[PDB]
Amino acid sequence: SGCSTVDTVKDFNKDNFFTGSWYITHYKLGDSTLEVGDKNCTKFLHQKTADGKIKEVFSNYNPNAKTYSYDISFAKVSDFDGNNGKYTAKNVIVEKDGRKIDERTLQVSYIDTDYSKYSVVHVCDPAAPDYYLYAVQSRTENVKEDVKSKVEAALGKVGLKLSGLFDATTLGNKCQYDDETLQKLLKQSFPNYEK
Numbered sequence: 001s002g003c004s005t006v007d008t009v010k011d012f013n014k015d016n017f018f019t020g021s022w023y024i025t026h027y028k029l030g031d032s033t034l035e036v037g038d039k040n041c042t043k044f045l046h047q048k049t050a051d052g053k054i055k056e057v058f059s060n061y062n063p064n065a066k067t068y069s070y071d072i073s074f075a076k077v078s079d080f081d082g083n084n085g086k087y088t089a090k091n092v093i094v095e096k097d098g099r100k101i102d103e104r105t106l107q108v109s110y111i112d113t114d115y116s117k118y119s120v121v122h123v124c125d126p127a128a129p130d131y132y133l134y135a136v137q138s139r140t141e142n143v144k145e146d147v148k149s150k151v152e153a154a155l156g157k158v159g160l161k162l163s164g165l166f167d168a169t170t171l172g173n174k175c176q177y178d179d180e181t182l183q184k185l186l187k188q189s190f191p192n193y194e195k
């Protein structure tokens with residue numbers, strides 16, 4: 001039952017983490033074998049402002065269907081678990097123009113990160129525990145060769161191996177990212193969630 005609890009990064013430096021963008025390079029979604037509809041290229045853009053708001057905008061592109069989906073996580077600094085890389089966010093699935101399609105609560109747990117290259121995350125919805133995500137994330141489109149070992153270890157903690165995830169860098173050539181929508185939605189106002 002429920003979302004798994006996983007150990008997370010101690011002394012999480014929010015300032016150094018929530019800036020710039022991330023590419024999702026590898027991931028396991030749920031228990032069943034992955035269908036092509038859930039094989040995507042995801043890039044996200046995020047920020048922490050002085051008011052203490054954290055905002056994270058995702059572009060998810062499915063090469064098989066050649067379609068995009070977008071979602072946004074909203075959180076506040078006081079939603080974090082002390083000094084650890086663990087927090088709850090309201091995540092809103094939205095149209096390109098920001099119109100709300102659906103919303104959910106996501107418990108986020110950062111297993112590890114070096115801030116400037118890679119992070120390893122577990123994301124889960126308490127209302128839909130069957131939807132859980134283990135993700136490898138990079139500051140570049142591919143994982144830097146010199147941190148592969150660090151990523152492998154992090155996945156070790158949670159009973160996983162890289163070759164055990166879907167490698168999104170296999171989509172590779174067909175991958176694309178809606179950078180302009182990312183930038184636009186990040187700056188756009190959402191008074192219903194930014195409160």
Ligand SMILES: NCCc1c[nH]c2ccccc12
Nearest residue numbers: 058071073106108121123135
């Ligand atoms: N965009 C919804 C799932 C997701 C992927 N990576 C994340 C990092 C933090 C929060 C959610 C996520």
